[PDB]
Amino acid sequence: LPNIVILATGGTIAGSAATGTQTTGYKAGALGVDTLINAVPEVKKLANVKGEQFSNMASENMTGDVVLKLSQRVNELLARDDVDGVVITHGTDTVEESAYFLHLTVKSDKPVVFVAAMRPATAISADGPMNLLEAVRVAGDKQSRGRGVMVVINDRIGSARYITKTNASTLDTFRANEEGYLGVIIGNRIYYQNRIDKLHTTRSVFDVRGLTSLPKVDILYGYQDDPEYLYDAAIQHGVKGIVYAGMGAGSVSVRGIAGMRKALEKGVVVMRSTRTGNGIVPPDEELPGLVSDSLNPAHARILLMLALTRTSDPKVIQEYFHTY
Amino acid sequence: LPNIVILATGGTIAGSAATGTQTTGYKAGALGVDTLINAVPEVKKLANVKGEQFSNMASENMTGDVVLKLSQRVNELLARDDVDGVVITHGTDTVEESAYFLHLTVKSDKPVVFVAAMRPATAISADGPMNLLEAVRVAGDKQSRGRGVMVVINDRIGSARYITKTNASTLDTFRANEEGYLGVIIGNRIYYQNRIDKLHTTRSVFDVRGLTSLPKVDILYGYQDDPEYLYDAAIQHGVKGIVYAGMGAGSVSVRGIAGMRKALEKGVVVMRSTRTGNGIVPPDEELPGLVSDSLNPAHARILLMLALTRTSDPKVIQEYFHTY
Amino acid sequence: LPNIVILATGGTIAGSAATGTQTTGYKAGALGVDTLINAVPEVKKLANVKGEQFSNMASENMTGDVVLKLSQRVNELLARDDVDGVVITHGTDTVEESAYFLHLTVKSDKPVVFVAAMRPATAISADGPMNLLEAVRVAGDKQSRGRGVMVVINDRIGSARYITKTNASTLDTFRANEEGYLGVIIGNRIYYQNRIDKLHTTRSVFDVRGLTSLPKVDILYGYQDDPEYLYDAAIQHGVKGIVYAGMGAGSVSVRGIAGMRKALEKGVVVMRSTRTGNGIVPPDEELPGLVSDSLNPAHARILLMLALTRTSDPKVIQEYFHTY
Amino acid sequence: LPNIVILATGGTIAGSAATGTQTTGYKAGALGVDTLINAVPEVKKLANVKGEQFSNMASENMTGDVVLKLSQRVNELLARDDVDGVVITHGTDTVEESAYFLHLTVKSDKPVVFVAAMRPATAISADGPMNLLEAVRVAGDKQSRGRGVMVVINDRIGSARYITKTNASTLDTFRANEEGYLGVIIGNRIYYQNRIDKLHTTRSVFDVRGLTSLPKVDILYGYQDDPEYLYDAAIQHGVKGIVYAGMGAGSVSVRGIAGMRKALEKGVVVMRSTRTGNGIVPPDEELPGLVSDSLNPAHARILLMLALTRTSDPKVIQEYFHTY
Ligand SMILES: *[C@](*)(CO)CC[C@@H](N)C(=O)O
Ligand SMILES: *[C@](*)(CO)CC[C@@H](N)C(=O)O
Ligand SMILES: *[C@](*)(CO)CC[C@@H](N)C(=O)O
Ligand SMILES: *[C@](*)(CO)CC[C@@H](N)C(=O)O
Predict the structure, then answer these.
(1) What is the CA radius of gyration of chain D?
(2) DSSP string, A213-278
(3) Which residues pair with B219 in a beta bridge?
(4) What residues does substrate bind to (chains A, B, C, D)?
């Protein structure tokens, strides 16, 4: 059997409430990794599992500095011969951020599978148990190698680069509308459909094993009457980059343009993404800053932070966004 | 033959570029309303149309005070016996904000149909001509009455309360994933599917007659390491409300909570929405602020601004969000 | 507390397997209604529940004659002053067929809610318990009256006229891509989004209470090289109607046309639907047969069968398809 | 510039109607290939194009014997030094069938791009011009090689193995809900997202050179009261295979089982697919026949016919279905 380590960080999958009917407002990251493993003994037939408690928090509190530590730990684990893959339990809210970060920084082809749950472990029809079993099956399957970081939940396997939480409260919230899933798990069998056509893991130039923190990047929303003062505030607090969750295709109002101009003059890298949820923000030389390709705001921030650890050259950063 | 006024405000539907191959980075709000009408003469066979140039700008620059005037003009036009419906051409980027605003403030059952286009009028296979023809057909059909404000594009009829631009650059970008479309237009025939189960138009309490400004409301994004200083900034600039495009179901980091607590202490109304794109943000007494129901950040801001013209009572505002 | 009758017919929601990992190939309709009720005792705090075992079969074996009896029993139940609503457990495979049948034949505004499950009751993370709890909540809410027959599963409420099983094996399989959901259930709260703009239940002319059998209607698929002989066979076996799951918008090959013409010559009513899964099959005077509006093949067969109990007039049947 | 052959077969992209408002009921395959090219002269700036009129028919009439000649003609063309890629204009109704056939029989890495249109060439806002332009761009791009056969339309690049017409009449009808698009075309630029993880083209064992016909395979629908006699009919007409567009995960009624048992006894290969539209039909020893993996009925018929040109062994055919 494959040797899989289950690195727990918290989340609803490890969440609990007083009643089985409470599916909201519960406490995330309240249960220990062994408790999750013990709740689904069946996993032992899929692999030799070892639980490790990295953290136990609600993912809304996951921070870059900690995600960095998470990446370094997974790298140490995957470096071992006695480890065939890693399953990371994480909160659903920012799992797309943590997953994409590792997608870009893990220097190994061994499976790295993030797993989450939309209902707490104590809930009626809790999804966590099955999601966990599926994540371990994916992590231990030899066919799962070299596919980049994955997010497993609700019978689906999504690429960290495309998958995103699209719904605030549904079990089937994780989807990649335009890119689909890398594969699915039905009847205890994995069906691989796609291989992402982007750079990742072993072919990524991003290495952070020698860092303890990342460049500061904030996200500003785009909407009617969007204020210039928010750009002022960001610049003033030392951001190194600003990701714009823009209206439509990263379109900018006169006030947004004024703010971006100020940011650029201060050496801040401006990256134009979109608030819409899907699609391409195309290049436009008549607008300030760079464009995020198909990266949504949350994903764009992660890549920009990592990009900033290697260069401040706009052209190099722009190419990164079209290839990662 | 129905009397339809086509009120123009700008957008890509009135956009142009030097070549038929340029579908991005073009000039929005470039063409006059009569140019659009004459480009699709067939609308004249469907109704007695009258073009009126309200404005001609890119929708990223559309502002609340201008939308306020737009709503007042439409209410005025619909009060006339010689006007059966109004079609409003608008840029795609913020049409959902302007459409929802009128959805709440136009006191008439006569059809108010926003229309737009994802490709400029000069582009190969431009969608504007057919979108406009369909919009006029919907506005002039008597079966279209009392349905709330609609947004017509790509053969679909979406409610202003549900429809949103989901893709940065595709023709089929406008969708209401969980709510579907009010109707579709195929083979020159309208197929009505649903009636929205929410308050609007003639049953709305949002009277804006005579107003010349709206309460200031800004939107702050939720993500890993989101900064508390953004809340400080908004508060310092006298916002009356803050809409939070939060992680998951409006989940808040320790920094976001600190920021929200300061806002609430200063009398700012905090509305928790989601950055995910769809779904319900459920009540949670353990978290600060109100919840946006299924309203996304953009729609949430519009409703909060209108709510604030009538009350500052959180309970009344919250009920508005569950009924409008 | 409302009085809710839970009418069981079978399905995976009442399915069993030897192991908790067995999610496919299990036995449907193995557990009794009372076993389902005691399994999720929480339903007892939402309503005064009473179980009734109408049947216990895999829905792939549900038949028109049995659905007729189901509709008749439901009408009987709802006529009682001591019954406020009914929840019907049914297999997922043909639930859209049984649901739409009752949608057209139940002469009452009291809630009729079909409920199902994609995972057997014995599977880990089985969805049945929560689906049933939600179905009862919907059935007993006064706001649920007069919305037509609904299908509740995976936190969603779908109209029997639009909802369909879109995926062979996923929990989120039931969707109405173009029409959306009537509502959703999150955090033990119901959020009603739409009201179907079609005739049903109390406003339907399809009363079948005095019937024991229904007109035979078969469905023939459209594809490259589709054979004429399938039509000859249907005709020879006395079909009164043929529903065509056609290529595109009910397009027909030279062979299909010959088959349809032979059928029409022999007194059979031909209804052209689509194999695509969604959308409108528009009127076309250059093609034989009627068109199914937005009804997919499964739904079209149900409406055609019922239509044939009242008329053989093509003009009348066609209007039914545009209004029901 | 690259040398691209535009091989025309007909379809709505070559359709014509007497007015610009008629988007349905038009005549498909009415315009010649050179006419389409002269309508979008911009293609000549993307490549040196040469039109070839293979046929001019509505795709509902495309037959296996003709598709064989199409595959053989394309193999012939791609073997040439002077042909960098081929764009094939085809009707939308069965393009998924023709495309998947070539996907399995064209032994070249050069781009094979099927293109189509949902609105006739004479229609207002016709999509054909842009679709063709995008198809030529994809066919001539070096980055497009070795991706399997593609279907380009509405700014999307879909794999022949996953793409399907999901809506009877919309412009955005072609989608692969669970698998996404291989890539998208926005702002005259191609954005490749995925590479399908299946066997195709150069790695296919399906040699069809020399064949003038294919084994007969028919499709039968699954629904309540499905008749056993259609199986009898298929058997009587000597079908070599039967694809079952089944209820749910290829579930079978008692009548369907009886019919399948008869077919199997007669040496007919039975393949269980699904009518739902998406998903995996998992293996089940308790049921007759093979399972179609994620292939829908139309795709399954194509693969089964080709599978039968190699063997009748069920085990081998089942493996073809899990790998192609
Ligand atoms: C429970 C559903 O995921 C809530 C968990 C969320 N706050 C998190 O990101 O941990
Ligand atoms: C063209 C497609 O909508 C871009 C127009 C947009 N900037 C606007 O909102 O006007
Ligand atoms: C289990 C998922 O619904 C299979 C049930 C199906 N055969 C039925 O319709 O009963
Ligand atoms: C026009 C839209 O595709 C109709 C074409 C269709 N009948 C075909 O397959 O050719």
Answers:
(1) 20
(2) ----EEEEE--TT--THHHHHHHHTT-SEEEEEEBTTTB--HHHHHHHHHHHHTTPEEEEEESSSB
(3) B243
(4) 59, 92-93
Round to whole Å and give the CA distance between B302 and B309: 11
Task: Give the catalytic positions of D in this structure.
Answer: 12
Amino acid at C206: F
> What six digits make up the tokens of B39?
């480009």
Is A151 in contact with A99 (CB distance < 8 Å)? yes
Name the structure determination technique. X-ray
Pairing of strands D183-186, D156-159: antiparallel
100-159 in C: which are within 8 Å (CB) of D? none
How far apart are the C-alpha atoms of B171 and B156, rounded to whole Å?
11
Distance set, CA D316 to CA C206, D302, D310, D312 (Å): 50, 16, 9, 8
Measured from the CB, is residue A238 less than 6 Å from ligand 2?
no
Residues of chain B with CATH 3.40.50.1170: 1-215
Amino acid type, B97: E
Rounded to whole angstroms, how far apart are CA atoms B35 and B88?
15
Of B23, B42, B154, the CB nearest to D124: B42
- From C168's Cα to the closest Cα of chain D, the distance in A is 4
Domain boundaries A1-215, corresponding CATH code: 3.40.50.1170
- Annotated active-site residue B12? The verdict is yes
Pairing of strands D112-115, B48-57: unpaired
- Substitution site in A31, A57, A59, A114 for ligand 1 pocket (most atoms within 8 Å of beta carbon): A59
CA distances to A136, A214, B234, B297, C315 from B300, rounded to whole Å, are 40, 33, 17, 5, 47
Q: How many CB pairs under 8 A join A and D?
A: 78
Contact, B102 vs B63, CB < 8 A? no
Say which CATH topology domain D216-324 has.
Answer: Rossmann fold (3.40.50)
The 3-class SS string of D202-217 reads: HHCCCCCCCCCCCCCE
Phi, then psi, of A36 in degrees rounded to 5? -70, -40
- Exposure string (b/e) for D198-227, b if CB count within 10 Å is 16 or more? bbbbeebebebeebeebbbbbbbbbbbbbb
Residue ranges of chain A that CATH labels 3.40.50.40: 216-324
Retrieve residue A237's tokens: 């607090």
| Partners of D157 in the β-ladder | D152, D183
The partner residue sitting opposite B172, judged by closest CB among D20, D119, D172, is: D172
